[PDB]
Short mmCIF file of C-alpha atoms in Angstrom, two decimals:
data_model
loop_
_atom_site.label_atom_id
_atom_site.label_comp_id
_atom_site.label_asym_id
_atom_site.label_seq_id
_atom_site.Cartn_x
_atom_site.Cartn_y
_atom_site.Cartn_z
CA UNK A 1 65.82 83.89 142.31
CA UNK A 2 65.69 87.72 142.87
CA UNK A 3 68.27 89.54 141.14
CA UNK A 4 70.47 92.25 142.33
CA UNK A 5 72.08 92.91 138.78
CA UNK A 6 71.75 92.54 135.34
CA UNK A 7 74.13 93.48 132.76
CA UNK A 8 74.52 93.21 129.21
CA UNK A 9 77.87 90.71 128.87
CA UNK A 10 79.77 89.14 126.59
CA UNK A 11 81.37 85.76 127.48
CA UNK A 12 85.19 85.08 127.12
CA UNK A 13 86.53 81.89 126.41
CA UNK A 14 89.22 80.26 124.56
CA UNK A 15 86.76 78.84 122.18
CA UNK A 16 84.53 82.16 121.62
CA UNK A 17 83.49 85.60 122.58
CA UNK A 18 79.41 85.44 122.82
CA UNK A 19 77.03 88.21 123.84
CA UNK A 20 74.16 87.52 126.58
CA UNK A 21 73.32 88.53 129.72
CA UNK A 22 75.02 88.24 133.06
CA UNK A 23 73.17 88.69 136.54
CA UNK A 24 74.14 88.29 139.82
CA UNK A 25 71.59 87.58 142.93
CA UNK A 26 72.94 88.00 146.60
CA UNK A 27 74.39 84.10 146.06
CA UNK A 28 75.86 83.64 142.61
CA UNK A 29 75.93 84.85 139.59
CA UNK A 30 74.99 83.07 136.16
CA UNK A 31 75.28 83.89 132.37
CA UNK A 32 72.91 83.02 129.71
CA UNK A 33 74.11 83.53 125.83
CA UNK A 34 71.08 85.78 123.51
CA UNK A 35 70.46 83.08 121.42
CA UNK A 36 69.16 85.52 119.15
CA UNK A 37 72.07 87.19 117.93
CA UNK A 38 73.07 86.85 114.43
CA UNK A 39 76.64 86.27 115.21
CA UNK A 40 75.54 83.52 117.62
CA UNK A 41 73.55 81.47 115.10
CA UNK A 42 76.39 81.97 112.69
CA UNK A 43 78.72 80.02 115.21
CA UNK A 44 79.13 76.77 114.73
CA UNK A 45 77.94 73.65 117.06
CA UNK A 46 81.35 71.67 117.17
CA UNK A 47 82.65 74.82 118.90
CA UNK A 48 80.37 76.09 120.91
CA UNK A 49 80.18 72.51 122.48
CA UNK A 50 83.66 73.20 124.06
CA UNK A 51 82.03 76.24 125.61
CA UNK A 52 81.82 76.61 128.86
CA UNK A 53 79.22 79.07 130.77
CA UNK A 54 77.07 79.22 127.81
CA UNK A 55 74.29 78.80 130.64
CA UNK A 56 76.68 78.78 133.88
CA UNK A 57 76.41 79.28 137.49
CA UNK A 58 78.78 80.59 139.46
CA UNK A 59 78.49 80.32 143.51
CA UNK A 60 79.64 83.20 145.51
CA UNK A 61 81.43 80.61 148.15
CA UNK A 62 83.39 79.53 145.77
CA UNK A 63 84.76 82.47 144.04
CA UNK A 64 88.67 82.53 145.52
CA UNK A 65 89.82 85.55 143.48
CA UNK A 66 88.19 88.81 141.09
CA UNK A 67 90.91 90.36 138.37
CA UNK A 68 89.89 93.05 136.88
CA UNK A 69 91.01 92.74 133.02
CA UNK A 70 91.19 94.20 129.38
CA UNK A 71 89.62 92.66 126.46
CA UNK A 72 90.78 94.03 122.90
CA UNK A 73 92.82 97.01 125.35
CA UNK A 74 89.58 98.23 126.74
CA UNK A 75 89.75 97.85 130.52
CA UNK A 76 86.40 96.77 130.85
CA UNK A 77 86.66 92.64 131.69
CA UNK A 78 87.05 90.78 134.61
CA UNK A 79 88.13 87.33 135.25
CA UNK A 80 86.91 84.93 138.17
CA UNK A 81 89.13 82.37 139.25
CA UNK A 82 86.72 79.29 141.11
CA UNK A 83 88.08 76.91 144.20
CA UNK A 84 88.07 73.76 141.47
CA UNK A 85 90.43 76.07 139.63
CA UNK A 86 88.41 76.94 136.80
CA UNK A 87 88.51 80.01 136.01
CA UNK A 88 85.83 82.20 133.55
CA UNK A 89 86.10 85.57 132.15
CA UNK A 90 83.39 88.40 130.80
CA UNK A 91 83.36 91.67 129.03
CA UNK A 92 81.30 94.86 129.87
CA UNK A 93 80.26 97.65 127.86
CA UNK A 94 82.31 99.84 129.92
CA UNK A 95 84.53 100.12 133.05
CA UNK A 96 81.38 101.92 135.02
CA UNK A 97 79.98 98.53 134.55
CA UNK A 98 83.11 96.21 136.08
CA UNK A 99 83.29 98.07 139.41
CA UNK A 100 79.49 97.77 140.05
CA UNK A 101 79.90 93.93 139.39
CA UNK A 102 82.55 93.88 141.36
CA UNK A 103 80.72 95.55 143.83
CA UNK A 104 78.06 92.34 144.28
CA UNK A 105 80.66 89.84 144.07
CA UNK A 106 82.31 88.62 146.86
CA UNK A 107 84.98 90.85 149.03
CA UNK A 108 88.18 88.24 147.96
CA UNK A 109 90.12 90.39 146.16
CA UNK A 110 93.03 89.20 144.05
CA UNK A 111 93.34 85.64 145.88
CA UNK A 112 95.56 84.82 148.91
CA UNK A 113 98.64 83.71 147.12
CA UNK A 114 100.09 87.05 145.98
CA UNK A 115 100.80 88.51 149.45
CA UNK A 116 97.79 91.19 148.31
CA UNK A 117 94.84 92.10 150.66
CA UNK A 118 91.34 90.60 149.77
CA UNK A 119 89.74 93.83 148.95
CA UNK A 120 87.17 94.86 146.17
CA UNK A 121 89.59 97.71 145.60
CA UNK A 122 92.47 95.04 145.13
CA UNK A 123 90.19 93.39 141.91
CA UNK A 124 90.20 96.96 140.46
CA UNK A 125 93.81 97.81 140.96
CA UNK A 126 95.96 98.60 138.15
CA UNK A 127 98.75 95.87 136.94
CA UNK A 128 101.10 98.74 138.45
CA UNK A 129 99.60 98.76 141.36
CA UNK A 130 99.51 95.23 141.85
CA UNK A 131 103.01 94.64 141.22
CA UNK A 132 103.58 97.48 143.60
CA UNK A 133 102.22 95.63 146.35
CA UNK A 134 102.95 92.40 146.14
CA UNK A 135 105.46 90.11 147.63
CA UNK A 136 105.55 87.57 144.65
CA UNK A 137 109.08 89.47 143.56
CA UNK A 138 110.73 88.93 146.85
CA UNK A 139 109.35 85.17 147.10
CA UNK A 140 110.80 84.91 143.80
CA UNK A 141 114.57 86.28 144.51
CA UNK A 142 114.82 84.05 148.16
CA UNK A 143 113.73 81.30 145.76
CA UNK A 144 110.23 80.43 147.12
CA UNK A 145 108.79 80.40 143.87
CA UNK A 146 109.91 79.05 140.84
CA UNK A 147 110.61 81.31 137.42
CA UNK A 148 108.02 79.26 135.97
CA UNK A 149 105.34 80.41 138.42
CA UNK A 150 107.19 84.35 139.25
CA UNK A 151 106.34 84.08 135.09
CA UNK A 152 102.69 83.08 135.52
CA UNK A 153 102.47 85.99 138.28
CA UNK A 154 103.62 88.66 135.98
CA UNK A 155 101.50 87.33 133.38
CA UNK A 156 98.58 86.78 135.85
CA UNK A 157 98.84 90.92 137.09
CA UNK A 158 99.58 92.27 133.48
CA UNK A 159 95.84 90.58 132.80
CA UNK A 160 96.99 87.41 131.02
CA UNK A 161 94.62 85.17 130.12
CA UNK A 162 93.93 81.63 129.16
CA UNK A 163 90.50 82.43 128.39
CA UNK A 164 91.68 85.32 126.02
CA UNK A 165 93.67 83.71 123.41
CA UNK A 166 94.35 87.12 122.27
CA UNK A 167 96.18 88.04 125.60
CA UNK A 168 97.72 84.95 126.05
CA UNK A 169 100.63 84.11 128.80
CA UNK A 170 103.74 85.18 126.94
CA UNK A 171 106.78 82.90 127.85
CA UNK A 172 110.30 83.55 126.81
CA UNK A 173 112.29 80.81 124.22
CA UNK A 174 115.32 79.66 126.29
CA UNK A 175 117.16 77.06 124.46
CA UNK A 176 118.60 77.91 121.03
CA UNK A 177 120.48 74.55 120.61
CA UNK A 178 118.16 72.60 118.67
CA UNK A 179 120.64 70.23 116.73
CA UNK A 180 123.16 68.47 118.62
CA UNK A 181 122.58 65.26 120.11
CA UNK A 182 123.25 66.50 123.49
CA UNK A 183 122.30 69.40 125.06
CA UNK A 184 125.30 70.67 127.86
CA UNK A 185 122.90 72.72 130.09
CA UNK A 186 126.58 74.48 131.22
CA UNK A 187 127.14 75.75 127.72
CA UNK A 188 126.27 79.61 127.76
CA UNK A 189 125.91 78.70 124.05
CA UNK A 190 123.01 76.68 124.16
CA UNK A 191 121.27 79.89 125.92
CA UNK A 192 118.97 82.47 124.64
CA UNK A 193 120.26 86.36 125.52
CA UNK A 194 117.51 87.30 127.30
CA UNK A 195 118.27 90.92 127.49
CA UNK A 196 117.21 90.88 123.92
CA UNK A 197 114.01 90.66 121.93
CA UNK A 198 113.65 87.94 119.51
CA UNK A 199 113.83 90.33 116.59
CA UNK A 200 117.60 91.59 117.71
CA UNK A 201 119.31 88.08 118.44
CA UNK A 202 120.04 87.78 114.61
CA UNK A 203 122.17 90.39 113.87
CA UNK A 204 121.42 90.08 109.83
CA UNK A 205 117.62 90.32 110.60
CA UNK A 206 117.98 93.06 113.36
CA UNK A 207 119.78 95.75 110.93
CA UNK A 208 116.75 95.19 108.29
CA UNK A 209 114.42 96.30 111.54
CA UNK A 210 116.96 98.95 112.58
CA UNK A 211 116.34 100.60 109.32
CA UNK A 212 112.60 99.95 108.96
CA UNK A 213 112.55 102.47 112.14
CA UNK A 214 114.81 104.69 110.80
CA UNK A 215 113.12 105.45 107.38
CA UNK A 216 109.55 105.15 108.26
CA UNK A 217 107.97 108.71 107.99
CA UNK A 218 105.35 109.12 110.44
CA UNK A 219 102.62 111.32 110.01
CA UNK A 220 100.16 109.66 111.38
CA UNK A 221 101.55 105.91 112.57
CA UNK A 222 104.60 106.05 114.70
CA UNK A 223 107.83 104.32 114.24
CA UNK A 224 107.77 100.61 114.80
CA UNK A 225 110.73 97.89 114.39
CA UNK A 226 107.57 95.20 114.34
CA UNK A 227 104.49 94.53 112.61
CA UNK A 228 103.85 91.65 113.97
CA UNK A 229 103.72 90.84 117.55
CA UNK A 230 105.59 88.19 119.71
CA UNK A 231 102.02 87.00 121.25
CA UNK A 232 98.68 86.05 118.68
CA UNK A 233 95.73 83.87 118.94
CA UNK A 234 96.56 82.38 115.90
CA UNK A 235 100.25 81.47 117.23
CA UNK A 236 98.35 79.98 120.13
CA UNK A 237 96.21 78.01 117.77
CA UNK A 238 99.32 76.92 115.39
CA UNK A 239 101.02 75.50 118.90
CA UNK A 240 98.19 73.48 120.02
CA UNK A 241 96.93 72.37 116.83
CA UNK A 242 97.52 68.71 117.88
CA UNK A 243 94.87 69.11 120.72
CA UNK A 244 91.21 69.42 121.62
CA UNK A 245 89.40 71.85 121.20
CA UNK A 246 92.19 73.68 119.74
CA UNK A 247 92.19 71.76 116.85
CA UNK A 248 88.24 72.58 116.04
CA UNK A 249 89.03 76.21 116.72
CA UNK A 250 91.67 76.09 114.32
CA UNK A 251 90.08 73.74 111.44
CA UNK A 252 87.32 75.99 112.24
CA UNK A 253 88.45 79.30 112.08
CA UNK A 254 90.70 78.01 109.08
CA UNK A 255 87.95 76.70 106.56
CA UNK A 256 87.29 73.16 107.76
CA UNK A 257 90.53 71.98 106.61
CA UNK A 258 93.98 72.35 107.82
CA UNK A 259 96.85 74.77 106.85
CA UNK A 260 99.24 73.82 104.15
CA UNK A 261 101.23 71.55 105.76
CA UNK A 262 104.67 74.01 104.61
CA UNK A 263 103.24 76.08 107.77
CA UNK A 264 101.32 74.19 110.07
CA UNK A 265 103.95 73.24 113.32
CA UNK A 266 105.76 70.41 112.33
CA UNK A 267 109.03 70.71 114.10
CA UNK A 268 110.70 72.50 116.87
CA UNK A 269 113.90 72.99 114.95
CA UNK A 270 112.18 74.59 112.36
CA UNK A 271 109.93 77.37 114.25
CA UNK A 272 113.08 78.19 115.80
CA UNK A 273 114.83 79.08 112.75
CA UNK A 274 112.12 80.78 111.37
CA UNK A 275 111.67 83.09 114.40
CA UNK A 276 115.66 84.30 114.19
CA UNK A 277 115.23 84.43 109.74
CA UNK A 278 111.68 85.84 108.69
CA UNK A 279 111.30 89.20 109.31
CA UNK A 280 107.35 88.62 110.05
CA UNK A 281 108.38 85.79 112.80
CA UNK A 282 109.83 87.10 116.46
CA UNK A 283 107.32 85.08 118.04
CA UNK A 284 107.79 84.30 121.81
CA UNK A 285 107.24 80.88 123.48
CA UNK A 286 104.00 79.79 125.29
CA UNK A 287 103.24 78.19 128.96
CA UNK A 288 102.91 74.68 127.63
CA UNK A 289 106.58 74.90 126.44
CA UNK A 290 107.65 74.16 129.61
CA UNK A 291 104.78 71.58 130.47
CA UNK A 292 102.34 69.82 128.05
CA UNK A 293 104.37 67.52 126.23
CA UNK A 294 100.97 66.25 124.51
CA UNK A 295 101.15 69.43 122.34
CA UNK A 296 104.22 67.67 120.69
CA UNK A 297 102.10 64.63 119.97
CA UNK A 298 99.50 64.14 116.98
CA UNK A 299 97.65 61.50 119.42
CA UNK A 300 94.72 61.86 117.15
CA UNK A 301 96.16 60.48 114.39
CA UNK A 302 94.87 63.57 112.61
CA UNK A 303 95.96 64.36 108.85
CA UNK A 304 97.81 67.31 108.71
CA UNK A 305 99.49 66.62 104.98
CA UNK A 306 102.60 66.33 103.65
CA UNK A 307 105.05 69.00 103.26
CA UNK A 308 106.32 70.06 99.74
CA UNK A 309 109.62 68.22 100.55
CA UNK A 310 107.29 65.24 101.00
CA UNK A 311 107.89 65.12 104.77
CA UNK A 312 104.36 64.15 106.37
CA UNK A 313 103.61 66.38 109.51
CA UNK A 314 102.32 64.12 112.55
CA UNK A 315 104.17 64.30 115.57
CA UNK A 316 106.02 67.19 115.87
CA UNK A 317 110.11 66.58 115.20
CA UNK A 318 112.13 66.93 118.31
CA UNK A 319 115.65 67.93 118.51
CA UNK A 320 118.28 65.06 119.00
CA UNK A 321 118.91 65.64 122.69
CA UNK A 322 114.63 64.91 123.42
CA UNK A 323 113.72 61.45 122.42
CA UNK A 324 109.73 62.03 123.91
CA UNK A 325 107.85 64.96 124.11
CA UNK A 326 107.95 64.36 127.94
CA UNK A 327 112.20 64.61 127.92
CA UNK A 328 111.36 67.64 125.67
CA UNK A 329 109.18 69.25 128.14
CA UNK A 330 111.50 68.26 131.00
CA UNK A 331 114.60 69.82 129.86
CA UNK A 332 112.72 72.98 128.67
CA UNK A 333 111.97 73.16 131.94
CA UNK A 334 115.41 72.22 133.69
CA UNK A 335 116.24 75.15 131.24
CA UNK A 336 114.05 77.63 132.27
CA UNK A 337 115.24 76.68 135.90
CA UNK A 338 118.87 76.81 135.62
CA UNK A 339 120.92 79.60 136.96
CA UNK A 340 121.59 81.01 133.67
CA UNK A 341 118.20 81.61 133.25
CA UNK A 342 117.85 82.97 136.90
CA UNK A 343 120.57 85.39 136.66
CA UNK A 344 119.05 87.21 133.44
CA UNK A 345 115.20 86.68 133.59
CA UNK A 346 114.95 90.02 134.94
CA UNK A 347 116.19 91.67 131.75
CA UNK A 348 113.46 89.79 129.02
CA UNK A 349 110.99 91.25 131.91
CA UNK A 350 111.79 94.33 131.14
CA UNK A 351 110.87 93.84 127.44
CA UNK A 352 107.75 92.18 128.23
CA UNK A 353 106.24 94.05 131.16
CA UNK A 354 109.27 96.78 132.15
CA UNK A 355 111.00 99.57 131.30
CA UNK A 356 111.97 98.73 128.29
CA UNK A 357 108.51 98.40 127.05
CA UNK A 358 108.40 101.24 126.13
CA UNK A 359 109.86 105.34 125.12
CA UNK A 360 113.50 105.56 124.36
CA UNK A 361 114.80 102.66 126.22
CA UNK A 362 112.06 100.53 123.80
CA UNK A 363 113.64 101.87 120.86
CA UNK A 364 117.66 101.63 122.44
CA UNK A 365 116.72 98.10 122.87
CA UNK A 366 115.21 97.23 119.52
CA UNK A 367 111.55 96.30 121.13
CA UNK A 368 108.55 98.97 119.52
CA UNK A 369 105.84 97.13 118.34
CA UNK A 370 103.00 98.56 116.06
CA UNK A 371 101.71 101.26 118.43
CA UNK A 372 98.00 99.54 117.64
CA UNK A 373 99.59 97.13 120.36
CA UNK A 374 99.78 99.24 123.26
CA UNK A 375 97.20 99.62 125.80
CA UNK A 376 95.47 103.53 125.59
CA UNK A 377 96.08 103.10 121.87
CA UNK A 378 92.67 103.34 121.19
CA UNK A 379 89.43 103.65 122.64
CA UNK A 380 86.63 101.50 120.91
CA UNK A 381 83.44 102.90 122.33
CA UNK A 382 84.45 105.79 120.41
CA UNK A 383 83.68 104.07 117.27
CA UNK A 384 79.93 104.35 116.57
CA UNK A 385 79.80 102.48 113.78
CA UNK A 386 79.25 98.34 114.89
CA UNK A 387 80.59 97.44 111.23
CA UNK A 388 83.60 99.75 112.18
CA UNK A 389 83.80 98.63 115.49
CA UNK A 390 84.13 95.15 114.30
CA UNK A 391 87.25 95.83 111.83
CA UNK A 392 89.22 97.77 114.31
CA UNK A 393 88.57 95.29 116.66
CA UNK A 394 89.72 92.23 114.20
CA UNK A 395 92.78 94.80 113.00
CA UNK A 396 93.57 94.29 117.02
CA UNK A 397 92.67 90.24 117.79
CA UNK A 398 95.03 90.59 114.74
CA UNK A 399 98.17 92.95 115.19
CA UNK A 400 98.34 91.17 118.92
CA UNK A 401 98.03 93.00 122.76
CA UNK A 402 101.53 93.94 124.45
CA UNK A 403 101.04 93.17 127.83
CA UNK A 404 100.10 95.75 130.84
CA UNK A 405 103.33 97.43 131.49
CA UNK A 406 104.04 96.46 135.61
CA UNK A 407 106.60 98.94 136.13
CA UNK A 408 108.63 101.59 134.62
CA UNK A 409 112.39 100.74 136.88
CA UNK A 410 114.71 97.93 136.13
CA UNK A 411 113.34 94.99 137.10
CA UNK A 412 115.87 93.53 140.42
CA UNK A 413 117.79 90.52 139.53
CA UNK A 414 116.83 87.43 141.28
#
């Protein structure tokens, strides 16, 4: 029908990032990929099956909530989050573009379940702002909402995605205790400090980062404990290996055939150690941690190889105190629940999206990431040059996004 808007767009998804066109008519809106872009006929089908909105529709009644959102740190996305749950997410060429859009979409705001008014200028509010206004904290601290779902929030506001595997929900590791046969959830022990980044619980490790930051002469590239961020794509793609799509994306993205098998996931145990020993590992935890057990499971009876060692890789090894993936996910979460999570959480929040993201506090706490990570670190459009464009931008889907910063005060205890 007649058309109120069209925009050139680029479609968001966990599978891939396609340019088209996106319109919206006084009813719905709908995208259609240019089918005649080179990159696009370079994809490949077994992918862009998994695709959704290739060609979709998207009715106006049944839009519940409008975020606005950053793709590759340029706030110029938005993601729309359906009644059936389903959620889809596009890029503009610019943030001119996002509030006209969100100027023909429906008046619903943020949703109804963050305590935030339904207004067009609630979709375009900052993370800050959002935060700000919300009553998601308070629900959290009289106990009306989980930490599992006060997590989601935060990573929900800061512009979290699981369209956008390259601003993925970033959830902290809470068990350490990935040996004995039992697991005492009463044993401080068994507990992650969550005051602390991943990089400063091993004291060995830490002191190599300590002096990275101390010696590194600046001229142009600021100081930096970490080159490698605690949230990827490709860490989202090593977790989920085991399941669909995620495994095409990965045997795609990889060369057809998987990684050698001395690095693909194999164990728990094992990713564990390596995040407190290698000093290119202080990778975070992910959502499904605490609730997709089938991530533990090579159901496909896929190949995955055989490890030097000549241990074959198919489901990945538990710890002793998880006989099934589902006990594993359980007590993850019982451990994410517990009090001595709930006392603390506060303090990895201001790592991830407080205070201590950042300025001298960030570098008291041992948390400064490649400053490539930060948003405002640089601004794309400014780069004229498409084959430039395109290396800065893979330099970024590749160094990893810090999430929006949601406030710059300690974070209140629950």
């Amino acid at each position: 029908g007649p058309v109120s808007l069209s925009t050139p767009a680029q479609l968001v998804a966990p599978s891939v990032v396609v340019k088209g066109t996106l319109s919206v008519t006084s009813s719905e809106l709908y995208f259609e990929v240019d089918e005649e872009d080179p990159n696009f006929k370079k994809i490949d089908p077994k992918i862009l099956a998994y695709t959704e909105g290739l060609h979709g529709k998207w009715l106006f009644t049944e839009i519940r909530s409008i975020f606005s959102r950053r793709y590759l740190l340029q706030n110029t996305a938005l993601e729309i989050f359906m009644a059936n749950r389903v959620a889809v997410m596009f890029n503009f060429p610019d943030p001119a573009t996002v509030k006209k859009v969100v100027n023909f979409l429906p008046r619903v705001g943020v949703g109804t379940s963050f305590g935030l008014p339904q207004t067009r200028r609630i979709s375009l509010a900052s993370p800050r702002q959002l935060f700000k206004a919300s009553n998601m904290t308070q629900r959290w601290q009289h106990r009306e909402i989980s930490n599992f779902e006060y997590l989601m929030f935060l990573n929900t506001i800061a512009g979290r995605s699981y369209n956008d595997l390259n601003q993925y929900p970033v959830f902290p590791w809470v068990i350490t205790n990935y040996e004995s046969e039992e697991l005492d959830l009463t044993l401080p022990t068994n507990f992650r400090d969550l005051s602390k980044p991943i990089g400063a619980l091993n004291p060995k490790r830490a002191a190599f980062f300590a002096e990275r930051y101390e010696s590194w002469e600046d001229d142009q590239v600021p100081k930096f404990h970490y080159g490698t961020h605690y949230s990827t794509a490709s860490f989202v793609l090593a977790w989920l290996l085991r399941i669909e799509p995620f495994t095409t994306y990965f045997l795609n993205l990889q060369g057809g055939k998987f990684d050698h098998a001395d690095r693909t996931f194999s164990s728990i145990s094992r990713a564990w150690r390596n995040s407190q020993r290698d000093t290119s590992d202080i990778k975070e935890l992910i959502p499904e941690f605490y609730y997709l057990p089938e991530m533990f499971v090579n159901f496909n009876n896929y190949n995955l190889g055989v490890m030097d060692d000549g241990t074959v890789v198919s489901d990945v090894e538990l710890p002793p105190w998880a006989k099934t993936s589902e006990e594993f996910v359980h007590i993850n979460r019982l451990a994410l629940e517990s009090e001595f999570v709930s006392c603390q959480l506060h303090q990895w929040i201001d790592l991830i999206f407080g205070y201590k993201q950042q300025g001298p506090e960030a570098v008291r706490a041992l948390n400064v990431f490649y400053y490539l990570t930060y948003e405002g670190a640089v601004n794309l459009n400014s780069i004229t040059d498409p084959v430039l464009r395109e290396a800065v931008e893979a330099q970024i889907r590749s160094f990893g996004q810090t999430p929006s910063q949601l406030l710059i005060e300690p974070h209140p205890p629950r």
